[PDB]
Specification:
The structure is a homotrimer. Chain A is mainly alpha-helical. Chain A has helices spanning 6-26, 33-57, 77-96, 101-122, 127-156, 161-187, 197-221, and strands at 62-66, 71-75. Chain A has one domain (1-230): Rhodopsin 7-helix transmembrane proteins (Rhopdopsin 7-helix transmembrane proteins, Up-down Bundle). The complex binds (2R)-2,3-dihydroxypropyl (9Z)-octadec-9-enoate (12 copies) and retinal (3 copies). It is classed as photosynthesis.
Chain lengths: 230, 230, 230
């Protein structure tokens, strides 16, 4: 098609589709009520992403935003996907370590503020204000990262060894890949505009696939997702 | 008013209003914590629908969408109602059979994908793509229907006989009436345009009232909604 | 800036920010799983409000709506904030008295109808219809107020005395301050237009800060938020 980033949108669509199908077939027959929750959560994540990658591929998920005296292409469908997928991914982690309800609310609520302030920043027509929104969004993210190291890492250790080991890996995956998101937004098409749109779209595609399908491959092969049973 | 479908919107509004009022008066005094949940869920459903039928009657819930080189009337308020009412109706069924949490998440999440992809298809400006969205939405629906027969029908039987009998009736009601929705959309104003808007609006009105107020009349007269008590 | 109401938006922003920071520092170290829920809920409330007051300050949260043959400034960001903060505030109360699930659903669902019909009324382009939406919204509110006196006040009394006393105060705070909202909307810029926008913005600022940060100061100093323990 006529937008150079199309190839990375097509490839993202295909990878999320294949991931959904694999997790769906792999979850068939699972009867353990605990693993059923982890399959439910983890298969819904790439199914949502599939539909929203497709909407960007087909042009629905794209709008033009005037700032810096120019009509800027903004993919708003990213924030519609992230709004529902990112709390499910934190739910996978919190259920692993059997977090208490107060802590789950805090994580999901902070996650909503991070995504919502990011959408306002993406659509903001006053250039300098877009970075104010980027700052508030990044602060909400640092709160989440703090919780994952100084609330969760200290209960998982008092848990089943298989739980503690699977959580450590997935926590480390989460902190590394989530930290790259604020930087790519800042230097790409929504921010300073140093990196062009087609390269920004490739970077996000590599990040989006790793943090959902990669994460899922690690979790759903683990023994931690089953109750202990004879 | 000046749109021929107004009479079916007015009648839908009145029927949802009367239904809400009846379920509200009937639920007064109920103290059983179990029946309270079924009344809560089941009365919220026609109250939401009342407000959204009214917005279509008054013109707020209507927009024009250009496709096939024509300005097409699209009632978007349908998807704002269905987004909150359809998961409540599946919650009535899952609580009946005491479904496990993993299965409820799967049903509600699949329901969200079905409604969300339906809204994208309703607003899509490229004619042939509207049917791609219709196909993904229908696939999410088939997943839901499968769950209701090959996950739920097999636990309800291991339950109280009054539960098993009320669920069978409501499951059958659900599968028959929900299957008509994809067909009416395809042949009506959002799709191929064979059936005109005023007749499509009548068909949906008959389907919307039956699946909410009819469903509710069956459930709230049943003994299944109470715990077993002496 | 060039809108006279800016000073009340700036002051609201600052007060919600300071409130968030105070509740955040005060909740540090709390380990009781019960108080953790009350801190989680109660700190998220002024953090959401901070971001949405800021969006009104910076102009993002403002739109123009044509009615009465005039282009009317409508702050739509109010309803985006109230949509997520008002159910959390009712969750604080229901958890205090350990409400049953059916009753919480009813309150949160009625709250959604009240806010949603209020947004439709704020954006409605036919003047006389805006008050129809105001009436349906006010009816949903009266339902909520009824529940708080003739469902909750009668279980809190059968509870811990510290719970019963803290709930009475917060219930009374809630009923008084929430009842002022329908009146200010009716006589201000969204309704009859008797009170001008800058004064309406001051009134709401005083109401918004009292009902969130004031409410929170009362609740989080109470002993009711902790389980009974030795
Ligand atoms: C898992 C196994 C596979 C791992 C794969 C990891 C890929 C992730 C990173 C890709 C960045 C590639 C960036 C390519 C940028 C080219 C930019 C370019 O053309 O620069 C010239 C410019 O136009 C004028 O100076
Ligand atoms: C529960 C007791 C009551 C049950 C009630 C069930 C009604 C449901 C179906 C109605 C379809 C009616 C369709 C009417 C279509 C008329 C179309 C027409 O006028 O066709 C001519 C056309 O304009 C040029 O060929
Ligand atoms: C907690 C301690 C502090 C308590 C503080 C409570 C304040 C709340 C109410 C304020 C209303 C003030 C209204 C000011 C209205 C002025 C209107 C005006 O100028 O009227 C003239 C008009 O322009 C032509 O007739
Ligand atoms: C436990 C539940 C916790 C839930 C916590 C949720 C946190 C979200 C808070 C604020 C972001 C609000 C974002 C609103 C963005 C609307 C932007 C929009 O729709 O813009 C339309 C148009 O382009 C412009 O007028
Ligand atoms: C002037 C400062 C600006 C205003 C402040 C920034 C607001 C938006 C940013 C981040 C949200 C941070 C997280 C909000 C949620 C906190 C939840 C909480 O306190 O949870 C405690 C509970 O004990 C858990 O275990
Ligand atoms: C722990 C995770 C935290 C994640 C958040 C980290 C944020 C700060 C990082 C980098 C900013 C680097 C400065 C970028 C600003 C460049 C300004 C500019 O105009 O640069 C000119 C350009 O390089 C040529 O034209
Ligand atoms: C457990 C919780 C599970 C929740 C699962 C949720 C599933 C929804 C997923 C994707 C649909 C997203 C739909 C987004 C549609 C937005 C369309 C819109 O607003 O269009 C505005 C404008 O007309 C055009 O720019
Ligand atoms: C190439 C194929 C296209 C991509 C695929 C279509 C995606 C969208 C369609 C349907 C969603 C189907 C349901 C998604 C939710 C599945 C939940 C699940 O797996 O739940 C298992 C759990 O054990 C429960 O008891
Ligand atoms: C189990 C529930 C499944 C529900 C989903 C079932 C979907 C397929 C059904 C019918 C499609 C029939 C074909 C419709 C296409 C008509 C094409 C056309 O242009 O027809 C010309 C017209 O008839 C004169 O002008
Ligand atoms: C347990 C969960 C219970 C949840 C209960 C939820 C109750 C909400 C119901 C109806 C309000 C719907 C409001 C929809 C308003 C949309 C307005 C809008 O977006 O307008 C865009 C544009 O300006 C115009 O086309
Ligand atoms: C013709 C009349 C117009 C139509 C009617 C107005 C609809 C919208 C207004 C108010 C919603 C009222 C509250 C709706 C929720 C009721 C929940 C319920 O019944 O809960 C019972 C349960 O036992 C709890 O403990
Ligand atoms: C329990 C909580 C309930 C809260 C809900 C209470 C609603 C009714 C209250 C007041 C309406 C007063 C009438 C306002 C209408 C004024 C009409 C008008 O045009 O007035 C002319 C103006 O005063 C000069 O030009
Ligand atoms: C599905 C893929 C994932 C892991 C999405 C994560 C998204 C973020 C961590 C977003 C954070 C942002 C910040 C912190 C600042 C503004 C821009 C973002 C919304 C991308
Ligand atoms: C409140 C009434 C009910 C039962 C609503 C049900 C709606 C559906 C089953 C919608 C399904 C659709 C599909 C499967 C395909 C695109 C069009 C729809 C969104 C109507
Ligand atoms: C965060 C502050 C609070 C307490 C917000 C409460 C908002 C209401 C009680 C809103 C009610 C409305 C009604 C009943 C009628 C239309 C206008 C409103 C949406 C403001």
């Amino acid at each position: 098609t006529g937008r150079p980033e199309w190839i990375w949108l097509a490839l993202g669509t295909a990878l999320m589709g294949l991931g959904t199908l694999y997790f769906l077939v792999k979850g068939m027959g699972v009867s353990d009520p605990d693993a059923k929750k982890f399959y439910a959560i983890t298969t819904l994540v790439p199914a949502i992403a599939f539909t929203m990658y497709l909407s960007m591929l087909l042009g629905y998920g794209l709008t033009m935003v005037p700032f810096g005296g120019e009509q800027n292409p903004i993919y708003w469908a990213r924030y519609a996907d992230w709004l529902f997928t990112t709390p499910l991914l934190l739910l996978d982690l919190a259920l692993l370590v059997d977090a208490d309800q107060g802590t789950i609310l805090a994580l999901v609520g902070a996650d909503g503020i991070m995504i919502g302030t990011g959408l306002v920043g993406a659509l903001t027509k006053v250039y300098s204000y877009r970075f104010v929104w980027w700052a508030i969004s990044t602060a909400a993210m640092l709160y989440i990262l703090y919780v994952l190291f100084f609330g969760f890492t200290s209960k998982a250790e008092s848990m089943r060894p298989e739980v503690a080991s699977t959580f450590k890996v997935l926590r480390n995956v989460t902190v590394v890949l989530w930290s790259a998101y604020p930087v790519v937004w800042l230097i790409g098409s929504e921010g300073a505009g140093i990196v062009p749109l087609n390269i920004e779209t490739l970077l996000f595609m590599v990040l989006d696939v790793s943090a959902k399908v990669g994460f899922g491959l690690i979790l759903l092969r683990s023994r931690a997702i089953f109750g202990e049973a004879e």
